[PDB]
Amino acid sequence: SNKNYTIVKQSNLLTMFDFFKDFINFSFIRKQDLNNQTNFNPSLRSIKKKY
Amino acid sequence: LFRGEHALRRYPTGEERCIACKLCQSACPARAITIETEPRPDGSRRTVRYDIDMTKCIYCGFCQEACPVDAIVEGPNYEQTAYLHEDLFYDKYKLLENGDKWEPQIARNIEYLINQPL
Amino acid sequence: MQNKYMQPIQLFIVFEKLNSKMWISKKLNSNHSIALIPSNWFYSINLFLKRELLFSNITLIENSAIDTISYNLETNQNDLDKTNIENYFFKNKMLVFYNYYNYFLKSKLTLFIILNNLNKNIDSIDRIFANANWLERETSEMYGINYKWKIDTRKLLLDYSKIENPMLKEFQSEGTQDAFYNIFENQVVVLKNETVEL
Amino acid sequence: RSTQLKFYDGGNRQSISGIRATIFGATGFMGPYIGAALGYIGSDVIFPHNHVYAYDDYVKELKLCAGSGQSYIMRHFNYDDDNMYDMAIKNSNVVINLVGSRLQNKNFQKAAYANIHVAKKIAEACARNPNVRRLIHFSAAGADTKSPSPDLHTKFHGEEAVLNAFPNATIFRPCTVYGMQDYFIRHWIKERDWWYHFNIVTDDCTAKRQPILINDVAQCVLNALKLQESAGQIYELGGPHVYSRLEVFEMLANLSGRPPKLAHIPHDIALKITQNFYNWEFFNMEKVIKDKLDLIVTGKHKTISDLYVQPVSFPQGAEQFIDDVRYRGVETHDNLEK
Amino acid sequence: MNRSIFQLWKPESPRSNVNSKQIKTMNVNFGPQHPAAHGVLRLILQLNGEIAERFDPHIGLLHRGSEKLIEDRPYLQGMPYFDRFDYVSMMVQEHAYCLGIESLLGTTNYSATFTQIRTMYDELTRILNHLLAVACHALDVGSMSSVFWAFEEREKLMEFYERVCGARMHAAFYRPNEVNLNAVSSFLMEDILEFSRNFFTTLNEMHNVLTYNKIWKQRLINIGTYSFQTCLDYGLTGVMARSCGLKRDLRLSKTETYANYYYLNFRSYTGQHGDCYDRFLIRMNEMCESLNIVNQSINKISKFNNIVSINTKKNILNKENFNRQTTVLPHLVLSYLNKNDYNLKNTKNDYNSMEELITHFKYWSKGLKVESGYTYQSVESPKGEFGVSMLSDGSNKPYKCKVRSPALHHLQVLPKIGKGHFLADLVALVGTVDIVFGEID
Amino acid sequence: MNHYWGSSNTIPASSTQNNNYFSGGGNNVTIRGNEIMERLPSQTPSQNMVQASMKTLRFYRKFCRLIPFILRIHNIGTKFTAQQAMINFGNYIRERNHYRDPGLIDHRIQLGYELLYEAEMHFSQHTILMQYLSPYNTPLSDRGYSYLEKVKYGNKSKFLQGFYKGNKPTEF
Amino acid sequence: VKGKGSIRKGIHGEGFGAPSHAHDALIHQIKQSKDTMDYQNITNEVAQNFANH
Amino acid sequence: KMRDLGFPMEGEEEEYIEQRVFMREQLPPLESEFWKKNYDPYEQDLFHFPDSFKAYQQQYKRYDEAKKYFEENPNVEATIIDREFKEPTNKKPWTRKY
Amino acid sequence: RVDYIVTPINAVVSWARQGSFWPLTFGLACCAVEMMHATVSRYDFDRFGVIFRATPRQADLILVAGTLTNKMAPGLRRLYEQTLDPKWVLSMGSCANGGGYYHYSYSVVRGCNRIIPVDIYVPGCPPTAEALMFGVLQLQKSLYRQINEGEKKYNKKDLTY
Amino acid sequence: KYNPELYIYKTYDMAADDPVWRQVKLDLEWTFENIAERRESLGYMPTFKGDPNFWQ
Amino acid sequence: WHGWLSHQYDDFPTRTGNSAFVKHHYLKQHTANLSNTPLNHVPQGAPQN
Ligand SMILES: CCCCCCCCCCCCCCCCCC(=O)OC[C@H](COP(=O)([O-])OCC(O)COP(=O)([O-])OC[C@@H](COC(=O)CCCCCCCCCCCCCCCCC)OC(=O)CCCCCCCCCCCCCCCCC)OC(=O)CCCCCCCCCCCCCCCCC
Ligand SMILES: CCCCCCCCCCCCCCCCCC(=O)OC[C@H](COP(=O)([O-])OCC[N+](C)(C)C)OC(=O)CCCCCCCCCCCCCCCCC
Ligand SMILES: NC(=O)C1=CN([C@@H]2O[C@H](COP(=O)(O)OP(=O)(O)OC[C@H]3O[C@@H](n4cnc5c(N)ncnc54)[C@H](OP(=O)(O)O)[C@@H]3O)[C@@H](O)[C@H]2O)C=CC1
Ligand SMILES: Nc1ncnc2c1ncn2[C@@H]1O[C@H](COP(=O)(O)OP(=O)(O)O)[C@@H](O)[C@H]1O
Ligand code: SF4
Numbered sequence A: 001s002n003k004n005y006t007i008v009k010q011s012n013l014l015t016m017f018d019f020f021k022d023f024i025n026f027s028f029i030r031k032q033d034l035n036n037q038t039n040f041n042p043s044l045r046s047i048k049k050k051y
Numbered sequence B: 001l002f003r004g005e006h007a008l009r010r011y012p013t014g015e016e017r018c019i020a021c022k023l024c025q026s027a028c029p030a031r032a033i034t035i036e037t038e039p040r041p042d043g044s045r046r047t048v049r050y051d052i053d054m055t056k057c058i059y060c061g062f063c064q065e066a067c068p069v070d071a072i073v074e075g076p077n078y079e080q081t082a083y084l085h086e087d088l089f090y091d092k093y094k095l096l097e098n099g100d101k102w103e104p105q106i107a108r109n110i111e112y113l114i115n116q117p118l
Numbered sequence C: 001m002q003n004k005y006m007q008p009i010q011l012f013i014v015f016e017k018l019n020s021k022m023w024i025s026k027k028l029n030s031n032h033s034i035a036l037i038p039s040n041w042f043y044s045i046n047l048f049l050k051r052e053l054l055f056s057n058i059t060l061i062e063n064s065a066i067d068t069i070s071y072n073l074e075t076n077q078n079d080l081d082k083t084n085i086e087n088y089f090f091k092n093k094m095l096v097f098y099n100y101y102n103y104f105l106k107s108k109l110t111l112f113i114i115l116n117n118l119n120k121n122i123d124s125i126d127r128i129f130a131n132a133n134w135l136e137r138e139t140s141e142m143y144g145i146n147y148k149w150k151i152d153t154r155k156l157l158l159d160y161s162k163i164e165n166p167m168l169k170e171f172q173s174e175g176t177q178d179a180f181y182n183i184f185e186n187q188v189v190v191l192k193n194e195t196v197e198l
Numbered sequence D: 001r002s003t004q005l006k007f008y009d010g011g012n013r014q015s016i017s018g019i020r021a022t023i024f025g026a027t028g029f030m031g032p033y034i035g036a037a038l039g040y041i042g043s044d045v046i047f048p049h050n051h052v053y054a055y056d057d058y059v060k061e062l063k064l065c066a067g068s069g070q071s072y073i074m075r076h077f078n079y080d081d082d083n084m085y086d087m088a089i090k091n092s093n094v095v096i097n098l099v100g101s102r103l104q105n106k107n108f109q110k111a112a113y114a115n116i117h118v119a120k121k122i123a124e125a126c127a128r129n130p131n132v133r134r135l136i137h138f139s140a141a142g143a144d145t146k147s148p149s150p151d152l153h154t155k156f157h158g159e160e161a162v163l164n165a166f167p168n169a170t171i172f173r174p175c176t177v178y179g180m181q182d183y184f185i186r187h188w189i190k191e192r193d194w195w196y197h198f199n200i201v202t203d204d205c206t207a208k209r210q211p212i213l214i215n216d217v218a219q220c221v222l223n224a225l226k227l228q229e230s231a232g233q234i235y236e237l238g239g240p241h242v243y244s245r246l247e248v249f250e251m252l253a254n255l256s257g258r259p260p261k262l263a264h265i266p267h268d269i270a271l272k273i274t275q276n277f278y279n280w281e282f283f284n285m286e287k288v289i290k291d292k293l294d295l296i297v298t299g300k301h302k303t304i305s306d307l308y309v310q311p312v313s314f315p316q317g318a319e320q321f322i323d324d325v326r327y328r329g330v331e332t333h334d335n336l337e338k
Numbered sequence E: 001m002n003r004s005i006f007q008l009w010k011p012e013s014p015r016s017n018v019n020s021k022q023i024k025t026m027n028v029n030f031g032p033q034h035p036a037a038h039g040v041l042r043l044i045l046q047l048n049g050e051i052a053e054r055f056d057p058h059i060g061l062l063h064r065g066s067e068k069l070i071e072d073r074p075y076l077q078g079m080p081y082f083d084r085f086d087y088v089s090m091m092v093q094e095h096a097y098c099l100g101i102e103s104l105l106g107t108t109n110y111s112a113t114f115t116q117i118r119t120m121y122d123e124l125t126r127i128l129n130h131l132l133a134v135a136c137h138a139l140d141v142g143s144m145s146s147v148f149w150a151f152e153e154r155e156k157l158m159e160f161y162e163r164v165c166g167a168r169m170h171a172a173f174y175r176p177n178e179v180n181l182n183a184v185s186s187f188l189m190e191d192i193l194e195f196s197r198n199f200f201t202t203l204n205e206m207h208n209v210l211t212y213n214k215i216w217k218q219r220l221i222n223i224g225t226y227s228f229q230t231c232l233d234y235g236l237t238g239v240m241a242r243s244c245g246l247k248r249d250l251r252l253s254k255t256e257t258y259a260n261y262y263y264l265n266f267r268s269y270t271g272q273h274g275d276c277y278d279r280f281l282i283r284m285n286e287m288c289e290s291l292n293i294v295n296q297s298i299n300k301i302s303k304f305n306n307i308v309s310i311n312t313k314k315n316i317l318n319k320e321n322f323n324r325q326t327t328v329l330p331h332l333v334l335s336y337l338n339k340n341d342y343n344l345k346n347t348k349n350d351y352n353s354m355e356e357l358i359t360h361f362k363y364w365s366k367g368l369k370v371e372s373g374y375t376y377q378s379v380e381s382p383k384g385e386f387g388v389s390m391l392s393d394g395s396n397k398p399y400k401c402k403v404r405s406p407a408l409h410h411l412q413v414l415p416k417i418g419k420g421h422f423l424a425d426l427v428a429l430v431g432t433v434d435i436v437f438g439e440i441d
Numbered sequence F: 001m002n003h004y005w006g007s008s009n010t011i012p013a014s015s016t017q018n019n020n021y022f023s024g025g026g027n028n029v030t031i032r033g034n035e036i037m038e039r040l041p042s043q044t045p046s047q048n049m050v051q052a053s054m055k056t057l058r059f060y061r062k063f064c065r066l067i068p069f070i071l072r073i074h075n076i077g078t079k080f081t082a083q084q085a086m087i088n089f090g091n092y093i094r095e096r097n098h099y100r101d102p103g104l105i106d107h108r109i110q111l112g113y114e115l116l117y118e119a120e121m122h123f124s125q126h127t128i129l130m131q132y133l134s135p136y137n138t139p140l141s142d143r144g145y146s147y148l149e150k151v152k153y154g155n156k157s158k159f160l161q162g163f164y165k166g167n168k169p170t171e172f
Numbered sequence G: 001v002k003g004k005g006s007i008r009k010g011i012h013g014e015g016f017g018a019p020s021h022a023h024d025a026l027i028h029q030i031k032q033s034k035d036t037m038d039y040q041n042i043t044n045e046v047a048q049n050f051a052n053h
Numbered sequence H: 001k002m003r004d005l006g007f008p009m010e011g012e013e014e015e016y017i018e019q020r021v022f023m024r025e026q027l028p029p030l031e032s033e034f035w036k037k038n039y040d041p042y043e044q045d046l047f048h049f050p051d052s053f054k055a056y057q058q059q060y061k062r063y064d065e066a067k068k069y070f071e072e073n074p075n076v077e078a079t080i081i082d083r084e085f086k087e088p089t090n091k092k093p094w095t096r097k098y
Numbered sequence I: 001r002v003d004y005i006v007t008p009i010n011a012v013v014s015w016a017r018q019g020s021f022w023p024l025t026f027g028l029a030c031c032a033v034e035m036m037h038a039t040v041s042r043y044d045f046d047r048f049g050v051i052f053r054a055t056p057r058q059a060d061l062i063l064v065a066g067t068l069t070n071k072m073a074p075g076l077r078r079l080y081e082q083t084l085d086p087k088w089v090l091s092m093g094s095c096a097n098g099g100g101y102y103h104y105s106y107s108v109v110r111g112c113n114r115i116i117p118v119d120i121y122v123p124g125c126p127p128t129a130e131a132l133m134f135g136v137l138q139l140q141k142s143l144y145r146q147i148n149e150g151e152k153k154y155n156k157k158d159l160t161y
Numbered sequence J: 001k002y003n004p005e006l007y008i009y010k011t012y013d014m015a016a017d018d019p020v021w022r023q024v025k026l027d028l029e030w031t032f033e034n035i036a037e038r039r040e041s042l043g044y045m046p047t048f049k050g051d052p053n054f055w056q
Numbered sequence K: 001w002h003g004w005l006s007h008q009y010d011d012f013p014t015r016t017g018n019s020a021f022v023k024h025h026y027l028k029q030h031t032a033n034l035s036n037t038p039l040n041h042v043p044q045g046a047p048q049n
């Protein structure tokens, strides 16, 4: 319910203001999946000359 | 090839190897070498003031590289820590004293350096 | 120059009202081409470059400026030919050059823009190329170019509460003032400059 | 001899002022400021000192007065050898003396030594050396033979001896000098912070005080050097107005916002305790004795107006040094930003 | 898993209290005296819950007017500024400056090209830079002993530097159209080979504690992710551009190669994820492959075969010849191809030849004359594409010398890739960008 | 407005409110804003000296509005009064009032805004930044001035004063 | 206009609110000069916010 | 609106939010926006309103006066402020007791 | 007299403060790399009991290792003033000593000694790791001897007064 | 593009995961062994000896 | 012995024998760092001198 207060006006904001053309201030947090991070398998793409 | 402390060498006879050509002064990237020369009473071309500002100088070795008579040599001494800033304004006295003290090792290194091209 | 090269004539084909002045030299890479671009069309040309098909994969590698007012041929003066790029340096107050790299064409493209107005006005392109922001900030602060429509005009790599354009040939390397410590003010102060001459 | 001093004051630290000065007793509060006064115009400064501990900031910061190749520090100075003084003042045309008995000293013999013997030897060395154009000895305001304070009692004899040995010596008698590192404003702040409830007074607090700024004192020194006629005369330096101890406390409290509170200890018992117990900077008999005594500018000698220096008022001058120590009461939200 | 977009982002609406900064954000001065900061970065950081929101970098704390001083000084005397620009790629900076000078002159350093120094030592400097970058990144993340482990190899490489030029740092070795052939020695090559063999142990020691660690993977993976479009827009190059998957390497470029790289069979690595973990893996693989490149370079100047006796079919070794001591001969190809030039170089000097003395005097009085013209020469330094744009007016001094440093462009993206991240992820990002402010300023 | 000067960049007056329960407001003109300045777009081009003068007047107005806060934060109020600092900066602007180039005026205004922001955010030191606010010919209010030169050279031309003062060290 | 409720499109453009509602100067400024402010103009709203603070 | 714009709509997709909300660059301004005759902030035209309201309108008389002044003085001398020491007019700092 | 107790306690204090000599984690330019080289195993700084601390409050030595710019001089002064006493200052490199390669620049201060009292100077560009070790050890010996350099005079009973 | 070749970290030794790096290690060790064998067969090493008479 | 410790060369000084180092008549005995001592480098014209 507390988040719904900040959620109220987002619809009108996005509807009336272009998200790309207009410079609108906002804040966000980046999320990572810890299970995927721990299960990730390191790997690289080796590149060599044509043969 | 290690470049440590600037020093001035002498010929085996004791005569100064430095002639006031100012090539080292011109080559010094940091303008750390000041040279003033006046003819000696005997008529030799010798400097009257040869100062190196150790605080303003980058230990590059261009002075020794440009010296045509191996007068100025960056000898291996590196334990030259100073407590007063004035102590790092090396003068002709200081350079000659360093050269006299470190001539053996400097000469030993110069032998190998000269023989390498051969 | 044993490579496959093509001139970047698309810009001048599209912008039909501009004349072409292009160069390539062995002093540069085999795939590097220089061209002259007018300032009043620089912004539109960058707009076209940033979203044209083959120029889409274009990155603004470098940008800077040259104070051409004091440029003089110190040697081989008579060897100068009317086709050399140096002919444009004389009598022009400033020359701002940008350099981009295109991946599709595996090419390097440099654009030279002559600023003759005394105030050094030119439209900024940091709104098209993101990395151009700091490059143009540095160019403006060091050479005094008055970029227009720029995202951020605040100085970058210059001291606080100081106004100067050190990279101009008029300015002296020793500067005009030195920072010392004042005991009366018990803090770092700045006063007139006295230096050492070799 | 000739007391003329040709120096150029229009240059910065890297210029050549034309003054070569030796400043004895520069490790005190006023020493660094006096040294910097001459150093910042390009003058050469020598600081002879035998200070413990050597690594103290007081000794260390003296090197900033002039710069590299212009400021020199002579350590392990011997004050009873004439050769040491001769070496110190060999190449100096100005000799400033600030060697006075410290507020931490109660021994009459030590105070007399510091205020008389060193000053007399410096004056004798200056007389021996014909290149010493100017001598500036720093005395204290209110010096008198009948003064209860041993410091003032010995300083009067010291200035008399300096005048006798070097008739062209200039004697200053500054009042209570205040500043960032002073012994008056800093002492007030530290005492109030250490007690948290009061400042301990030992008298009626009716003694008159005429504070002067250390910057003004340095400007007075520079003006005295500029003026040739100032040689051989005694100057009393002080602020534009005279305040009692109670008035000074009131002014400081009003400026800083800290409510005033003076806790009284009987003068006799305070004197007995301080004279029978160990004395340090914040607990000494000299402060107790000088609390009652008046240290103001008298008309018997030349004043600062003669040196042509306009001292700043104490309320204006001392305000900047108490900005950090300010009472935090009710303040606006905008002021809360800081 | 349910949606969390509303909990993850908070937009700002015009004149709305709820959609606004309802808190007093923390404006911290990250650096300059901050262990994470390299020392000359004053980043005004707007933290809100210890999460970065707004970046205001100030980078002028190490501005020194290097370009102005270079313009004031002649060509040769301005070279050490390029060593000063980068504290870990000084050899590459010198190589770029000399490449520009020789491109202006219209010639190439055949001596260096045939001696292979300008490629093997470039790779050694790349190993130095990668070691320092990975060590600093690990130290910032929290791992301690990696710094000591990498700095041991750094000390070995600096010993090689001092042996070849007498300066363990700021070599100032490369110079245009000249090489100190005397310094190059076979025993130096053998010691470099021993170092290359032993470097695998240090690489494995770091890899065991970093590569597979769960904490390291959770710290780096999916942090600072960016796309090829971001790389293109911000001009990212080197390890970041390869982390973008662009497959952009200037050493293996037909029209942009500058040394023996184009004729060596080595591999460049790119990742399908543009994150710190991929960048770290790429740095490790580049360090490993530098060993192979150095091995190839040294083999290019080696005489493996030997005379075989007809009767016994066994090698005939020279007992009193220098070639028996070692199998690597730096001067082999140079002597074989440019015999006249090598003979002149080793026979004529300033102490016996009037022309040599005149050349030396002029060279050390006023730098070599450079024909007027504009050039732009670039190299693949460990931190990205490092370029020099030089305009010469025909005198002994450069009229203009602009330096395109990849560090500036890499630092430009730091707000972009670290906006929504925490303070730890930001101190991780500053290390992963691999920035040294000497060249930035 | 997404700008450092926007009306939404104010510092909240409470942890749960903006200055009231029935209204929303804050101060951003006489003090620094809540969020730092990430970008300062260049002043829109001025085609007329009228527009250039308007920009100069608005910048000077902002400086006058901000000077008391700057003085309080930098602890330089004793050196000069707020009005004294305003008058000193006005003299500084007067020295440059001869400009007649809109582009140069815009560049100068951008630089002035940048330096004012630095003063607000303490990027500069008080001693370094007080050079603009210092009186041109009046003594600093926190120091005792010396009128020895005026007494010595009273009713004498500036040329004679400079002649007696000198313009080169006399030792060398 | 599709998806904008009562907002309706004029000849030269589409309005930012319902027909009879009042136009907002702050919204107009945000749209036209987004992110750009030559100077901190003290409007009635700004003055009232200062007074309330 | 978020799904129309392209934001993540799943928990596993929440970890690539920055690629859809912040990483994407903003379209550069049209070049026609740089040719506007005037850039003054928009305000309601107070024509037909009371004089009290018009008092809050932008002062066009000041613009006209500035235009007249700049037409009359296209070129002026550079003002120089004397640096010679002068006794302060406000002597309060050196003449105040309390 | 107090000297009987002061002098041995002086020696103990000097020994302790020499053994525990924590510099400040502050590097500005390439000389920071040499400082890290001196910290790392090859020349173990911990052998002489010197451990770097991040905060100036917990630092005994101010290692000015790198160039000082006008834009940074107030910062260096503030760090020096905020470092708790007693403290010493060691300039490292030509740039920190006397401006080094950039002595003729418009941005670089001609020496950190103009802003700070420099206790010791270590010439070099960059100074070697052994050079920095030598400077640190010489500074430690000087620090140990600073407590009593024979200032006070001995009376007829050999007790200092 | 159509036949990607990847390097996969799957063992403690990163050299082992690549056939080329194993060959690099083997070649380095082979070179060291060859040098050692040649020097042992020779039985001694000539060296440059300083001579003070060189400075007559 | 400085070079011998530094491993610049494998030759070391030998007293009373065939040496690898030249012994000129103008050589002076080695001295440790004399800084912070009265016998320190004093520039000509410096205040200390
Ligand atoms: C265990 C066996 C069993 C039997 C029991 C035996 C006894 C058990 C006792 C248990 C309790 C022990 C408590 C003390 C522990 C040790 C610490 C200590 O001694 O204090 C020093 C310690 C020093 O201060 P600090 O905070 O460490 O210093 C910080 C920095 O130095 C300051 O930095 P700064 O920059 O702010 O510097 C400012 C400047 C100072 O700032 C200023 O500039 C302003 C001040 C300058 C003048 C200072 C003069 C001294 C003032 C004394 C204050 C006493 C506090 C009470 C005041 C009451 C007044 C109404 O600083 C100074 O100079 C420092 C102060 C110097 C003090 C020197 C004298 C101390 C020793 C003697 C004290 C005698 C007091 C007796 C009180 C009455 C007792 C009934 O604190 C004190 O000075 C306060 C001590 C007060 C308690 C004394 C207890 C012993 C005497 C009791 C009476 C006799 C015995 C009765 C019982 C008999 C039973 C059989
Ligand atoms: C673990 C060791 C603990 C040591 C604690 C020592 C406590 C103090 C001991 C004082 C001994 C006094 C002996 C007789 C003195 C005779 C001279 C005289 O006139 O007497 C009056 C003396 C002299 O003071 P005065 O000011 O009256 O006179 C000066 C002397 N004349 C006049 C001759 C010039 O004063 C006293 O009241 C006694 C001495 C007080 C000393 C105060 C400083 C002490 C410093 C201690 C340093 C060691 C700290 C150890 C802990 C360190 C932790 C890291
Ligand atoms: N409030 C004030 O400051 C006033 C000062 N004065 C005079 O001005 C002078 C300078 O002022 P200030 O800095 O405040 O005073 P200080 O007490 O701080 O300075 C006195 C100096 O003399 C030295 N000294 C003390 N005793 C001896 C001794 N026996 N032998 C040798 N040197 C000794 C001290 O050195 P060490 O550190 O080694 O003990 C110190 O350097 C004072 O000494 C006094 O004469 C006059 C009126 C007011
Ligand atoms: N000591 C050496 N230094 C340089 N090149 C050498 C040396 N020894 C042999 N070579 C090279 O080896 C080739 C000749 O081979 P080979 O006849 O086996 O050698 P050598 O006759 O000197 O024993 C030439 O290319 C020659 O330059
Ligand atoms: S080492 Fe370089 S900078 Fe130093 S004195 Fe020699 S030539 Fe000059």
Ligand code: SF4
Pocket (backbone or CB within 6 Å): B017, B018, B019, B020, B021, B022, B023, B024, B025, B035, B066, B067, B068, B069, B070, B071, B072
């Ligand atoms: S040191 Fe060498 S280069 Fe310098 S003046 Fe003497 S002889 Fe010439």
Ligand code: SF4
Pocket (backbone or CB within 6 Å): B058, E084, I029, I030, I031, I065, I066, I067, I092, I093, I094, I095, I096, I100, I101, I124, I125, I126, I127
């Ligand atoms: S003195 Fe030399 S090594 Fe040290 S910071 Fe300056 S240029 Fe770099």
